[PDB]
Amino acid sequence: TCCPVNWVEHERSCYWFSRSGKAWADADNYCRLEDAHLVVVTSWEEQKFVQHHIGPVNTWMGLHDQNGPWKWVDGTDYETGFKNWRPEQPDDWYGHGLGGGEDCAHFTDDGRWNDDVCQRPYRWVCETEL
Amino acid sequence: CCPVNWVEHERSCYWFSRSGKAWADADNYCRLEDAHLVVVTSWEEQKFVQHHIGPVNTWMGLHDQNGPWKWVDGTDYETGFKNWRPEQPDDWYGHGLGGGEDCAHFTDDGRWNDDVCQRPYRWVCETEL
Numbered sequence: 340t341c342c343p344v345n346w347v348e349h350e351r352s353c354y355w356f357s358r359s360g361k362a363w364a365d366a367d368n369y370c371r372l373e374d375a376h377l378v379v380v381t382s383w384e385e386q387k388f389v390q391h392h393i394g395p396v397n398t399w400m401g402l403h404d405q406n407g408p409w410k411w412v413d414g415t416d417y418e419t420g421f422k423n424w425r426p427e428q429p430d431d432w433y434g435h436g437l438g439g440g441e442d443c444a445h446f447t448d449d450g451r452w453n454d455d456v457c458q459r460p461y462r463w464v465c466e467t468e469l
Numbered sequence: 470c471c472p473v474n475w476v477e478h479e480r481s482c483y484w485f486s487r488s489g490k491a492w493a494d495a496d497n498y499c500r501l502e503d504a505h506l507v508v509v510t511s512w513e514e515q516k517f518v519q520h521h522i523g524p525v526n527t528w529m530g531l532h533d534q535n536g537p538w539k540w541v542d543g544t545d546y547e548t549g550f551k552n553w554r555p556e557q558p559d560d561w562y563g564h565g566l567g568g569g570e571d572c573a574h575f576t577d578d579g580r581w582n583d584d585v586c587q588r589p590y591r592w593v594c595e596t597e598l
């Protein structure tokens with residue numbers, strides 16, 4: 340019916356914006372503990388709203404290809420859904436030399452998306468639907 | 470003898486990762502091997518590690534998570550070798566990831582920086598023969 344304290348209501352969704360960083364899997368588990376999920380972006384207006392609140396900061400979202408194809412954490416279909424990748428992304432870059440490609444999506448400093456190493460610590464956003 | 474895939478140098482055995490881990494994960498990996506994250510105590514050891522890692526950010530066994538700077542094997546920091554980059558350590562909070570910077574790594578020129586412990590970097594394990 341309503342969002343918990345320190346959460347922001349927007350278009351029937353509640354959002355919590357971290358002010359600290361976590362590896363993607365740890366951010367994912369943090370959102371689950373709160374009965375939420377990492378933010379799932381399905382429109383230009385929702386993208387604009389998230390971008391306004393995070394500012395120019397690398398921030399994890401609930402999109403990954405750890406099991407093969409790109410998937411949203413709540414089952415929202417990727418192929419038929421909203422996409423806002425940065426130019427030349429996703430690229431599954433191995434050149435970071437950290438092992439593996441890049442399997443986790445994050446907003447970049449301009450809001451557009453990048454795939455990065457899931458173990459990098461970034462700020463994240465939780466979302467729950469009313 | 471050092472184990473297979475380890476490099477012998479001046480009575481120590483070293484293992485150089487080709488993948489990255491958060492400092493506590495790298496620390497756990499080295500202990501599993503009855504080793505410890507590399508402890509650098511001389512200019513010759515520093516030059517040796519530098520040669521094998523190249524210009525890559527790499528964790529070492531030096532941290533200030535519990536207060537003062539400490540080497541993982543109990544080697545005294547104050548009286549020991551130091552090779553910090555200029556203006557380092559700085560315990561930078563500006564990364565916005567939470568806390569300052571408590572873990573030391575070699576930088577692209579071999580000199581040390583303190584950084585966020587949860588950052589995935591390559592690492593070096595060391596064991597003494």
Ligand SMILES: CC(=O)N[C@H]1[C@H]2OC[C@](CO)(O2)[C@H](O)[C@@H]1O
Nearest residue numbers: 397428430432441447453454455
């Ligand atoms: C934070 C960020 O945007 N990283 C990107 C960028 O840095 C290297 C790379 C390939 O050039 O582009 C690779 O795609 C990374 O994932």
Ligand SMILES: CC(=O)N[C@H]1[C@H]2OC[C@](CO)(O2)[C@H](O)[C@@H]1O
Nearest residue numbers: 526557559561570576582583584
């Ligand atoms: C990889 C690396 O050397 N990072 C450093 C460098 O980047 C930001 C900072 C302060 O400006 O300097 C801070 O000291 C970081 O720890």
Ligand SMILES: [Ca+2]
Nearest residue numbers: 352379380381
């Ligand atoms: Ca949503």
Ligand SMILES: [Ca+2]
Nearest residue numbers: 404431441442
């Ligand atoms: Ca990938």
Ligand SMILES: [Ca+2]
Nearest residue numbers: 430441453454
């Ligand atoms: Ca990428």
Ligand SMILES: [Ca+2]
Nearest residue numbers: 481508509510
């Ligand atoms: Ca040593």
Ligand SMILES: [Ca+2]
Nearest residue numbers: 533560570571
């Ligand atoms: Ca510190």
Ligand SMILES: [Ca+2]
Nearest residue numbers: 559570583584
């Ligand atoms: Ca620093």
Ligand SMILES: [Cl-]
Nearest residue numbers: 459460588589
């Ligand atoms: Cl990082």
